[PDB]
Design a protein around this ligand. Structure first.
Ligand SMILES: COc1cc(Cc2cnc(N)nc2N)cc(OC)c1OC
Ligand SMILES: [Ca+2]
Length: 164
């Protein structure tokens, strides 16, 4: 099962503030929605609560220590093992939100769906750093009136290597 990340980022690798996104990008969010369509959404509790509601078209799997955490139209996992368990028959998943959720799926990550907004915002949350990788795709995001920022979509798959 392909373990993919889906993050929208910043100049300073900002991916949030008190809980929500510092930017308002309906186009970006559409590219997000389309890309992950058909695949589960792996996201932490405070993250999903930022999102606000179950994103349709995909298994909404949530992560939390809380054994007694439930939320309608959503699956909940207390372990990475329990996510891999749930998504055992999945061809690909998308790690979505919570900087600490990334660090849990870090050891397994396969593909990186990183958006980079060319600005410096004020944010509390940030994205863990990484050493590789290998960019396979790149496209600029639509800067409109409703997308008042310049940002590009960046895809990264693991860098191979020629046997010594
Ligand atoms: C509904 O779509 C949302 C998705 C996300 C997570 C997320 C969304 N897109 C990308 N590219 N990376 C992410 N980590 C975060 C959100 O706010 C926290 C969303 O809306 C509220
Ligand atoms: Ca893997």
């Amino acid at each position: 099962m392909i373990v993919s990340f889906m993050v929208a980022m910043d100049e300073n690798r900002v991916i949030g503030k008190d809980n929500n996104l510092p930017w308002r990008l309906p186009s970006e969010l559409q590219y997000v929605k389309k890309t992950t369509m058909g695949h589960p959404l792996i996201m932490g509790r405070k993250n999903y609560e930022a999102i606000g509601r179950p994103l349709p078209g995909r298994r909404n799997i949530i992560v939390t220590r809380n054994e007694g955490y439930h939320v309608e139209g959503c699956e909940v996992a207390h372990s990475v093992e329990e996510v891999f368990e749930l998504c055992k028959n999945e061809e690909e998943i998308f790690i979505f939100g919570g900087a600490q959720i990334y660090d849990l799926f870090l050891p397994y990550v396969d593909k990186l769906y990183i958006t980079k907004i060319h600005h410096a915002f004020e944010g509390d949350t940030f994205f863990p750093e990484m050493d590789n990788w290998k960019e396979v795709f790149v496209e600029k995001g639509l800067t409109d009136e409703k997308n008042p920022y310049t940002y590009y979509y960046h895809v990264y798959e693991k860098q191979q290597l020629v046997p010594r």
